[PDB]
Design a protein around this ligand. Sequence first.
Ligand code: ADP
Ligand code: ALF
Ligand code: MG
Length: 414
Amino acid sequence: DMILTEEMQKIMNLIQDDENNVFVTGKAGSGKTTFLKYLIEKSGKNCIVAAPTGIAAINAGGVTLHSLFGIPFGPITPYDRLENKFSEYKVELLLKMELLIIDEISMVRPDILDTIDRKLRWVYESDEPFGGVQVVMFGDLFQLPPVTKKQEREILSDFYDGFFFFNALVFKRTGFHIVELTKIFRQTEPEFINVLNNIRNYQVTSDELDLLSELKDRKINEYIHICTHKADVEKINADKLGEQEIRNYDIVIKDKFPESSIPCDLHLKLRVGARVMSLVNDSLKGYYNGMLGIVTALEDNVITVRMDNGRTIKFERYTWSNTEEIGSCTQFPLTLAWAITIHKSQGLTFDKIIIHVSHTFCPGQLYVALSRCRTLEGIVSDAFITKQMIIPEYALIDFERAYKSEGNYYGKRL
DNA sequence: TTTTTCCG
Ligand SMILES: Nc1ncnc2c1ncn2[C@@H]1O[C@H](COP(=O)(O)OP(=O)(O)O)[C@@H](O)[C@H]1O
Ligand code: ALF
Ligand SMILES: [Mg+2]
């Protein structure tokens, strides 16, 4: 029931005939990730798939960029020395790879792409960008941008003219075609589609937004909550958890580990039937950051979860390090997940959603929230949708103007 | 504000 469009066929043929890098873009729900999976299945190339968030990576069938390439947290400058500590298994996988596929490219920082370039040139012992691997990037720059803190932007501004993937320094040595998928599949209502598109490109009017008046406090566990803020996610999850038959698991912290740096729950509260997400990758055991499941049993030292993909996993406690090394913390690598942030929702489709957007603070955040849903009637909102929720990023206007006027190509022409 | 590592 997947439709192969002529645009998709042309892009397939482009990637097979032309070794250039490619950005496949298009609006929310235009079939980008669906086509990604088609491209790989049909290409004869060895492909590896990655994405910046764990949820998006799982949705595309791959792994996070940070896991695949062993990337540390925090900004990486071109002068920082990288630990090249790949196992032989990982080196071999990266050497066999012919095509690197990255989904949700909009959330990829430019220093992440440059780190990937540097690590691949080290693995391949080559001066070719990305070690000579062909890179195909999928996404929508008008959805969420990469997560950066103010201090990180300050550090990065010495080397980067902006904070989107196309600002990476590697694009002074290589470049990419931009191709687009222009048919929307996720939604089917033309007026809903028109308002989504005009929110996306900042052109929406007051009159167009009137279509969304029925969202706020709409009268109706089928509705999925997606929120701008983690504090809201935590409240909704605690509500849905309840107080019946709860088990609590306390973190053990050992020495230095600021509380604002702890990656896990301080007091993990669970029950049988609880919707949860894995926080860590363990490919040997078949689980990965962002994988979703349902708790089926709780014990002293083991939490049993039936994953959405049908696997039952027995989670034991995991130990994080804060480094060199000074302190550590130990806790089950699980967190409740009925509710999720909008950043985590990017890439997913839902029939029924409740969005908490009374405070938006990222370009593309409102657009991602609304565009998750297949129909207008399936959205409930905590707030009236207004133009103040839209935050323009004019560097994206400049970028599209540049490539559209220069032959749908960006970066160094080869 | 929001996110993210290293196959035993
Ligand atoms: N080629 C296609 N034919 C039919 N339906 C599609 C196609 N591509 C996507 N869809 C529908 O749209 C939904 C979202 O598509 P997806 O690939 O996730 O969009 P994108 O990654 O562009 O946001 C899918 O769940 C499916 O219902
Ligand atoms: F562009 Al998408 F889900 F990947 F809307
Ligand atoms: Mg997608």
